[PDB]
């Protein structure tokens with residue numbers, strides 16, 4: 001997260017860290033046994049870390065659970081990043097409490113101007129790499145589809161939306177991929193891609209979760 005602030009320990013109880021000997025992507029807990037992340041974060045040997053704040057220190061509240069299976073959306077396109085969503089089933093259910101909790105799926109899509117909370121342990125530099133130990137937060141609005149298409153002509157599908165600041169300086173970045181974009185208590189987006197991080201007129205692009213609710217429910221119901 002570039003230009004964000006320190007969230008504060010366990011203030012984002014649905015945020016998870018995908019770990020393979022290091023933190024490589026974020027995710028959101030949607031129930032005690034399932035996590036939603038981005039398809040391009042897929043790899044084998046994933047350990048999901050819940051209740052984290054400092055990812056380099058065991059501070060208490062952490063639950064480390066292996067993923068039993070990862071389900072990348074069948075129509076995911078790694079060249080356009082269209083349908084950049086993945087569901088991860090945990091080997092055992094997590095113990096939910098005030099520090100570890102799931103976030104709700106939306107019932108409707110959000111409108112432009114909606115303010116959302118984006119969080120993650122991704123890079124904090126736009127010009128260089130600096131990875132934080134604790135969780136960073138960024139409040140950002142969803143932009144209109146016209147501004148988004150204007151910024152990324154020909155690259156925005158109906159399953160994506162832009163959120164951020166056209167002036168640059170505040171944005172999600174590598175390392176934050178797969179994590180949550182929560183607006184009014186519902187998971188509306190998944191951090192997916194952008195041109196650089198925090199560059200002027202190059203806002204972040206997020207997977208539009210409201211377009212996948214039925215797929216998520218049906219897939220979880222059958223696995």
Ligand SMILES: NC(=[NH2+])c1ccc2[nH]c(-c3cc(CC(=O)[O-])cc(Br)c3[O-])cc2c1
Nearest residue numbers: 171172173174177192193194195196197204
């Ligand atoms: N501007 C944004 N809002 C944004 C959001 C997610 C991002 N993810 C990535 C990303 C970049 C790499 C670069 C590399 O190959 O080292 C790798 C991954 Br995986 C990313 O998700 C960039 C990136 C930018």
Ligand SMILES: [Ca+2]
Nearest residue numbers: 054055057058
């Ligand atoms: Ca920790």
Ligand SMILES: [Cl-]
Nearest residue numbers: 149153154155
């Ligand atoms: Cl276009």
